[PDB]
UniProtKB/TrEMBL annotation, chain A:
GO terms for cellular component: histone acetyltransferase complex; nucleus. This is histone acetyltransferase. GO terms for molecular function: histone H3 acetyltransferase activity. Keywords: Activator, Acyltransferase, Bromodomain, Chromatin regulator, Nucleus, Transcription, Transcription regulation, Transferase. GO terms for biological process: positive regulation of transcription by RNA polymerase II. It comes from the Eukaryota. Belongs to the acetyltransferase family. GCN5 subfamily. It comes from Chaetomium thermophilum (strain DSM 1495 / CBS 144.50 / IMI 039719).
UniProtKB/TrEMBL annotation, chain B:
Residues 5-64 form the ZZ-type domain. It is found in: Nucleus. Residues 71-119 form the HTH myb-type domain. Residues 66-119 form the SANT domain. This is Transcriptional adapter 2. Residues 154-173 are annotated as: Disordered. Keywords: Metal-binding, Nucleus, Transcription, Transcription regulation, Zinc, Zinc-finger. Residues 71-115 form the Myb-like domain. Its main location: nucleus. It comes from Chaetomium thermophilum (strain DSM 1495 / CBS 144.50 / IMI 039719). The chain holds residues 12 to 405 of 519 of the full protein. Transmembrane segments: none annotated. GO terms for molecular function: chromatin binding; transcription coactivator activity; zinc ion binding. GO terms for cellular component: nucleus; SAGA-type complex. GO terms for biological process: chromatin remodeling; regulation of transcription by RNA polymerase II.
TrEMBL record, chain C:
Belongs to the NGG1 family. This is Uncharacterized protein. It is found in: Nucleus. The chain holds residues 264 to 730 of 730 of the full protein. It comes from the Eukaryota.
Length: 352, 339, 212
């Protein structure tokens, strides 16, 4: 039980679902939520946040302290007929972020919507630093909804990254801990019901005389019953992804997080510009290289370096050097070279 | 590394042994001294390990079905561990962690069936650990051969698989779909409302924490009442906007082309009369408005009479069908289809 | 030991068990859904958007004529019946038949417009006090202060008096609403009253003819 749970049980904190009805308490709660959201999202105008929070269709779930102080909250607009609700904001005061309230609040929201209505899907536009939190809370970057269900209904937010989540029916998301722990306990007991590792076997009969010679594991009775084969032994040591998957994933996350990679986050549309495809015969963006890496097509790091260099070259080719596009592309090339130089292995691949 | 797991490395060959059958030295002289099957096969000893007179233990990889004929113990444990770490609902990473080339859809279906949607409750399987038919229904060798075959086939397919198509630009909802730039018919909201500046007075408002009532008088403190009073005006503004939208929805004021075409086909005097009569539409409903206008036009056309126009239709050799019956009957009550 | 699933709600249940079900320890009382303009039509919007829009200036100017405040200028449009001597067989009967209905409708519209104008004259004075009390608070934020000013204390009392006393007259709900077809027989031209309007207008016509 994380500190949020004990604090809630002891009455230190408390949650409240509030909409702009016109009471006294509701207005305090809504204004505090507006203050928090305005603090955390400085880029957007304060007018737009003020309009969205104080609307008459949206809801809000907030966490309040005993002397009526609000720490954070989430805002959403349910589409009851379309079986999906949109999340529009999310934030917690930075001073109190260390406690770890985010998952607890998300569980409260999911449970409430599940038990009060019949929605299934959540659609959101995540910020560029909340992606880890959203992923840890069950969302995914791949969308599995038809283009008719959620087109024209949600509102685009520039600089975002749409995500999805499909709630699993008939579960109590607040008690995940104990339920999953018991499920693990019972599967582990089932496993321990057979595992012969509790049997302390004598030295192999070939080595009982003091001579050590190779022994085929399939010869032994216990191992034989274990069904060990050379094939599985050799296969179990091959990771699903490429060996550098963790390091390239770290680099990809750093590059995406960097505020110098915005123009490449998504490709350029054919409708908006026609000459982009006609001039560039190898249009490459970040999503394309990520997918190709997921396909294992990139055999060597040189492929990734060439892809980045070609992306930069295309950016400079389609957009003039004087224009900010090419200058930003060169700055991002410098940033990637910095990241690589931080890696000794790839430091020697920089041309002179 | 973001993963919270523990990596196990053999003490002799320094080869990962976590996901493989292994053997450990059980003598108290050796602590956490793990020897892989090859090392224990070739018998390469190090430190205080004695393969001659010390009893050993065989760590089994526990490969056989328990719940699902296509899934073994290791796969299920990895699934639940991923649920603990990667969060229950994150199917992509948990599928990646389980391995075996199970696409996210397959892992989701397997979990739903086995645990969530099942003839079962959070106590797994039929009755107890005493039910041991599935383990002795297939020999482990056959199951492992099936796993090897499926893995090799899947690897070959992936190597021969076609390249994944590049992601297109994300399908921006662009709620401007209506034929009025900046109209969001999916939300029934405009972008530039009646008093879009109304929020200019409450976008900086802040409340004193933990306040709301006077500790002494029991009444709202002057600042609190003043602050509350400035939001009642905002609520009234919102309600005015809502009434505006309700009125505009009716009467079909969103069909620019049709209404303009209809006015264009109309003559001068009829256009002027309809323009004059426009304002009262707020107080009637569509049918009443149509009756009112059509009555005015009928009166004007009859006065004039006393493609072809109405004045040219009334003076036709054959009278139209709707003019052979009194509009209001003898007992003073107008006919229902007055206009 | 503890329940692992969600317990479905039932109508007419106790508040404490409602919180138990929700676990959130509170909830809004009124859904406020009745103020929604209407549920979304539930269509398929993936169809290609039109590529030629019309500027908001044009649309605003196009709908502006439908909401201008009422004035005595248009209170004279109705209250006018036109010429009734020169036109006066079938067409003459038709015209005599239709003039009376026209007059009845116009009379009813006159009966409504007066209360509408009174409400307008009320709102134009309420809005001034609303604006003054709103602006007398922005200065506090600007200077960030101290006690509330006497002006800010006495404007609230004036506003509250004005509302609670005068606005009682306009309590009727129909002073701000447009009747809707979906509700049913909401037409403001019920025969039960149109009959008497018709008879009164005929009496007035006969009196005018006698004078003329």
């Amino acid at each position: 039980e994380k500190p949020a749970v004990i604090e809630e049980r002891n009455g230190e904190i408390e949650f409240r679902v509030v909409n702009n009805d016109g009471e006294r308490e509701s207005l305090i709660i809504l204004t505090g939520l507006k203050c928090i959201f305005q603090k955390q999202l400085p880029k957007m105008p304060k007018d737009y946040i003020a309009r969205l929070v104080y609307d008459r269709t949206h809801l809000s779930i907030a966490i309040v302290k005993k002397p009526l102080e609000v720490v954070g909250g989430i805002t959403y607009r349910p589409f009851k007929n379309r079986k999906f609700a949109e999340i529009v904001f999310c934030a917690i005061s930075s001073d109190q972020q260390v406690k770890g309230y985010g998952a607890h609040l998300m569980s409260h929201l999911k449970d409430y919507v599940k038990a009060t209505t019949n929605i299934e899907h959540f659609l959101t536009y995540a910020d560029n630093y909340a992606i880890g939190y959203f992923k840890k809370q069950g969302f995914t970057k791949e969308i599995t909804l038809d283009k008719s269900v959620w087109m024209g209904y949600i509102k685009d937010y520039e600089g975002g990254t749409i995500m999805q989540c499909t709630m699993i029916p008939r579960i109590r998301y607040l008690e995940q801990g104990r339920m999953l722990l018991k499920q693990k306990e019972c599967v582990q007991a089932k496993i321990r019901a057979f595992s012969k590792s509790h049997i302390v076997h004598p030295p192999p009969k070939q080595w009982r005389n003091g001579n050590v010679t190779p022994i085929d594991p399939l010869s032994i009775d216990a191992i034989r019953e274990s069904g060990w084969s050379p094939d599985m032994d050799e296969l179990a040591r091959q990771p699903r992804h490429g060996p550098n998957y963790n390091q390239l994933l770290h680099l990809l996350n750093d590059m995406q997080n960097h505020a110098s990679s915005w123009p490449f986050l998504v490709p350029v549309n054919k409708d908006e510009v026609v000459d982009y495809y006609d001039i560039i015969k190898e249009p490459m963006d970040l999503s394309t290289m990520e997918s190709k890496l997921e396909a294992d097509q990139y055999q060597t790091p040189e492929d990734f370096i060439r892809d980045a260099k070609l992306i930069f070259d295309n950016c400079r080719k389609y957009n003039n050097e004087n224009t900010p596009y090419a200058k930003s592309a060169n700055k991002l090339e410098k940033f990637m070279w910095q990241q690589i130089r931080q890696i000794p292995e790839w430091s020697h691949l920089e041309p002179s | 590394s973001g993963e919270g797991g523990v990596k196990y490395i053999c003490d002799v060959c320094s080869v990962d042994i976590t996901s493989t059958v292994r053997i450990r030295c059980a003598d108290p002289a050796c602590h956490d001294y793990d020897l892989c099957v090859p090392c224990f096969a070739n018998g390469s000893s190090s430190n205080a390990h004695k393969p001659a007179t010390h009893s050993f233990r065989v760590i089994e990889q526990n490969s056989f079905p328990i719940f699902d004929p296509d899934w073994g113990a290791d796969e299920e444990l990895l699934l639940l561990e991923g649920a603990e770490i990667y969060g229950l609902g994150s199917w992509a990473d948990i599928a990646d962690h389980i391995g075996g080339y199970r696409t996210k859809d397959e892992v989701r279906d397997h979990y739903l069936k086995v645990y969530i949607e099942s003839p079962n409750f959070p106590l797994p399987e039929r009755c107890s650990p005493y039910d041991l038919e599935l383990p002795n229904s297939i020999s482990r060798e056959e199951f492992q051969a099936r796993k090897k075959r499926r893995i090799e086939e899947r690897r070959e397919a992936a190597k021969n698989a076609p390249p994944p198509q590049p992601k297109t630009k994300p399908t921006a909802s662009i709620p401007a779909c209506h034929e009025i730039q900046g109209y969001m018919p999916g939300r029934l909201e405009f972008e530039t409302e009646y008093c879009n500046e109304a929020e200019e007075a409450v976008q900086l408002m802040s409340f004193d924490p933990g306040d709301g009532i006077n500790p002494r008088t029991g009444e709202l403190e002057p600042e609190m009442e003043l602050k509350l009073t400035v939001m009642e005006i905002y609520n009234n503004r919102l309600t005015q906007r809502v009434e505006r939208k309700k009125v505009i929805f009716e009467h079909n004021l969103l069909e620019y082309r049709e209404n303009t075409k209809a006015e264009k086909k109309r003559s001068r005097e009829e256009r002027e009369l309809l323009n004059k009569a426009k304002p009262f539409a707020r107080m009637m409903n569509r049918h009443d408005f149509e009756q009112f206008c059509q009555g005015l036009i009928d009166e004007l056309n009859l006065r004039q009479a006393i493609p072809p126009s109405g004045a040219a239709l009334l003076v036709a050799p054959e009278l139209p069908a709707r003019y052979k019956e009194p509009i209001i009957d003898a007992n003073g009550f107008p006919r229902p289809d007055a206009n | 030991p503890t329940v692992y699933e969600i317990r479905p709600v039932l109508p007419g249940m106790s508040e404490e068990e409602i919180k138990e079900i929700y676990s959130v320890a509170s909830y809004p009382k009124s859904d406020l859904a009745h103020l929604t303009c209407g549920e979304p039509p539930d269509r398929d919007f993936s169809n290609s958007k039109p590529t030629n829009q019309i500027n908001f200036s044009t649309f605003s100017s196009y709908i502006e004529p439908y909401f201008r405040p009422f004035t005595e200028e248009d209170l004279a449009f109705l209250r006018e019946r036109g010429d009734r001597v020169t036109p006066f067989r079938v067409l003459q009967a038709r015209l005599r038949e239709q003039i009376l209905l026209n007059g009845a409708r116009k009379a009813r519209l006159t009966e409504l417009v007066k209360e509408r104008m009174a409400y307008q004259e009320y709102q134009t004075i309420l809005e001034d006090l609303d604006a003054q009390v709103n602006a007398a608070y922005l200065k506090r934020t600007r200077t960030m202060g101290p006690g509330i000013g006497d002006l800010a204390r006495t404007l609230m009392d004036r506003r509250r008096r004005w509302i609670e006393q005068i606005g009682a007259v306009f309590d009727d709900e129909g002073i701000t609403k447009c009747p809707r077809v979906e509700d049913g027989d909401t037409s403001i031209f019920g025969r039960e009253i149109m009959a008497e309007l018709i008879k009164r207008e005929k009496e007035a016509w006969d009196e005018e003819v006698e004078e003329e």
